[PDB]
Amino acid sequence: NYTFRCLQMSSFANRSWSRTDSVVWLGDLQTHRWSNDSATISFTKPWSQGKLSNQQWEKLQHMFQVYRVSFTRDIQELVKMMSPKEDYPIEIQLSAGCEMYPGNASESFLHVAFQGKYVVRFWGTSWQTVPGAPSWLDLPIKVLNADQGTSATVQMLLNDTCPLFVRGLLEAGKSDLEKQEKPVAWLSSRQLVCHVSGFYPKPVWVMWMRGDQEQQGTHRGDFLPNADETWYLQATLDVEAGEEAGLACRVKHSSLGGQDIILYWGS
Amino acid sequence: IQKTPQIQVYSRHPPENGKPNILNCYVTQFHPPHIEIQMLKNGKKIPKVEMSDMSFSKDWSFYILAHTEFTPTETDTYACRVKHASMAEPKTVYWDRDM
Ligand SMILES: *[C@@H]1O[C@H](CO[C@@H]2O[C@@H](C)[C@@H](O)[C@@H](O)[C@@H]2O)[C@@H](O[C@@H]2O[C@H](CO)[C@@H](O[C@@H]3O[C@H](CO[C@H]4O[C@H](CO)[C@@H](O)[C@H](O)[C@@H]4O)[C@@H](O)[C@H](O[C@H]4O[C@H](CO)[C@@H](O)[C@H](O)[C@@H]4O)[C@@H]3O)[C@H](O)[C@H]2NC(C)=O)[C@H](O)[C@H]1NC(C)=O
Ligand SMILES: *[C@@H]1O[C@H](CO)[C@@H](O[C@@H]2O[C@H](CO)[C@@H](O[C@@H]3O[C@H](CO)[C@@H](O)[C@H](O[C@H]4O[C@H](CO)[C@@H](O)[C@H](O)[C@@H]4O[C@H]4O[C@H](CO)[C@@H](O)[C@H](O)[C@@H]4O)[C@@H]3O)[C@H](O)[C@H]2NC(C)=O)[C@H](O)[C@H]1NC(C)=O
Numbered sequence: 001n002y003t004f005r006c007l008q009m010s011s012f013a014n015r016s017w018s019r020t021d022s023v024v025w026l027g028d029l030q031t032h033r034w035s036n037d038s039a040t041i042s043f044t045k046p047w048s049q050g051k052l053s054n055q056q057w058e059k060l061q062h063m064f065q066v067y068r069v070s071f072t073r074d075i076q077e078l079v080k081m082m083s084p085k086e087d088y089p090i091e092i093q094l095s096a097g098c099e100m101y102p103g104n105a106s107e108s109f110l111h112v113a114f115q116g117k118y119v120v121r122f123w124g125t126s127w128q129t130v131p132g133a134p135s136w137l138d139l140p141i142k143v144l145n146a147d148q149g150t151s152a153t154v155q156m157l158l159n160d161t162c163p164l165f166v167r168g169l170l171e172a173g174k175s176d177l178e179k180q181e182k183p184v185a186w187l188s189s190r191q192l193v194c195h196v197s198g199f200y201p202k203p204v205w206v207m208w209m210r211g212d213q214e215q216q217g218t219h220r221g222d223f224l225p226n227a228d229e230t231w232y233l234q235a236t237l238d239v240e241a242g243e244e245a246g247l248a249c250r251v252k253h254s255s256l257g258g259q260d261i262i263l264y265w266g267s
Numbered sequence: 268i269q270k271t272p273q274i275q276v277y278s279r280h281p282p283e284n285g286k287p288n289i290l291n292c293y294v295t296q297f298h299p300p301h302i303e304i305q306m307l308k309n310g311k312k313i314p315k316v317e318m319s320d321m322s323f324s325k326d327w328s329f330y331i332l333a334h335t336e337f338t339p340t341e342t343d344t345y346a347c348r349v350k351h352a353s354m355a356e357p358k359t360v361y362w363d364r365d366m
């Protein structure tokens with residue numbers, strides 16, 4: 001499965017100041033950025049254009065350019081019309097894209113959050129408020145649904161453009177998407193810590209062992225990203241001291257073959 | 268409403284004294300997205316810190332990763348200090364010399 005997610009983050013401080021920035025991910029790898037200070041969408045991979053031609057890419061980019069200006073104008077107009085009921089500052093986030101599944105399968109999404117809370121989605125052929133969203137959103141959403149052109153374009157982008165573009169990405173990015181990077185491990189410390197860093201892809205197994213027996217008390221921490229598209233994880237084990245002798249951290253990962261890393265506490 | 272940042276500091280390679288390495292400061296779970304992040308060496312601001320693009324998670328909270336070249340030694344401390352509207356005072360988390 002890979003999920004392609006286009007993330008837009010827009011901040012409005014007052015009638016005079018706002019910015020919109022986006023980042024696009026395929027799985028856990030960034031493919032684009034679009035900074036507010038930039039006229040055009042930046043590639044963060046050599047394959048970020050997927051299989052689109054320079055001219056399709058340009059048309060697609062020009063639509064987004066138009067959308068980003070329209071979006072900004074429409075939200076500021078919306079705040080004026082509601083004044084003084086919707087107060088600055090305002091934070092709007094959108095998460096849009098598709099999840100590619102086994103075979104030909106894909107599902108798209110478009111969710112919108114306001115002040116950090118999900119309020120609206122596009123589903124089927126229209127925009128909807130999600131239950132629990134503030135009731136002042138109903139009217140502007142009813143209005144936006146009367147805009148047939150936007151509805152068709154959003155339907156096309158979600159139902160058609162997204163999956164097709166992403167199949168081109170997985171083709172074009174294949175060698176980065178399937179890359180394998182090997183973890184290095186080290187031990188520190190009462191509480192024993194096994195630190196494992198530099199692995200890719202994300203799936204990994206890390207355990208405190210005594211001989212053949214997995215120590216059940218092993219606690220896996222969170223996966224933390226490194227800055228070079230690899231992952232960091234630690235696993236910790238609480239142990240009565242003296243008692244440290246005979247424990248080892250074991251790491252199993254696809255990049256290693258069946259050559260696990262085994263680190264024994266005590267050297 | 269506001270969410271206070273969580274801060275974790277950890278090194279890219281095993282930290283060995285005198286060996287150049289990369290120290291990471293990952294700041295998560297915050298809202299709104301405006302934030303200020305410094306990495307400190309003995310309490311002083313480190314100049315060349317690189318930041319990722321800000322992004323957000325499934326639960327909508329924001330996150331960003333900062334990282335810098337560093338050499339662990341027997342006598343230097345390192346830390347990550349964050350300023351955010353959700354806190355009255357800048358919050359600082361020291362690297363624990365192991366992570
Ligand atoms: C794009 O795909 C849309 C489906 O995909 C979902 O949403 C998108 C945006 C992505 O997130 C994707 O991953 C999702 O899976 C598709 O939306 C579908 O559009 C058709 C109309 O073109 C809808 O048909 C109408 O349905 C209603 C019934 O709606 C209710 O009941 C059904 C289940 O029984 C639910 O699923 C709905 O959610 C509602 O609860 C009918 O009343 C209606 O019939 C009337 O109109 C037709 C003429 O079109 C006449 O022939 C009939 O006799 C009636 O007069 C329609 O059948 C369908 O509900 C809708 N799906 C959803 C989930 O809303 C969209 O059309 C695609 N667009 C393009 C351009 O490809
Ligand atoms: C995110 O990106 C968007 C879109 O690019 C930014 O929105 C645009 O911001 C620009 C730059 O601020 C802005 O251009 C202004 O239009 C004003 C009228 O509405 C002009 O009056 C103003 O001109 C002054 O500043 C210019 C340099 O920026 C000078 O070259 C010019 O000579 C003018 O200088 C006079 O007036 C200014 C006051 O504006 C004054 O300080 C000077 O001393 C002198 O009196 C700008 O051209 C666009 O209107 C915006 N475009 C949009 C909304 O589509 C947005 O700001 C970005 N957000 C952030 C935070 O970066």
Ligand SMILES: CCCCCCCCCCCCCCCC(=O)O
Pocket residue numbers: 006007008022024032034041064068096097110157158161162165
């Ligand atoms: C709104 C539907 C988006 C999904 C369509 C898939 C086409 C890929 C676009 C890739 C670059 C887009 C950059 C995001 C711009 C933005 O959100 O403001």
Ligand SMILES: *[C@@H]1O[C@H](CO)[C@@H](O)[C@H](O)[C@H]1NC(C)=O
Pocket residue numbers: 013014016017
């Ligand atoms: C709008 O907010 C910006 C960003 O905080 C701030 O610098 C400025 O005071 C405001 N602009 C005006 C004209 O008030």
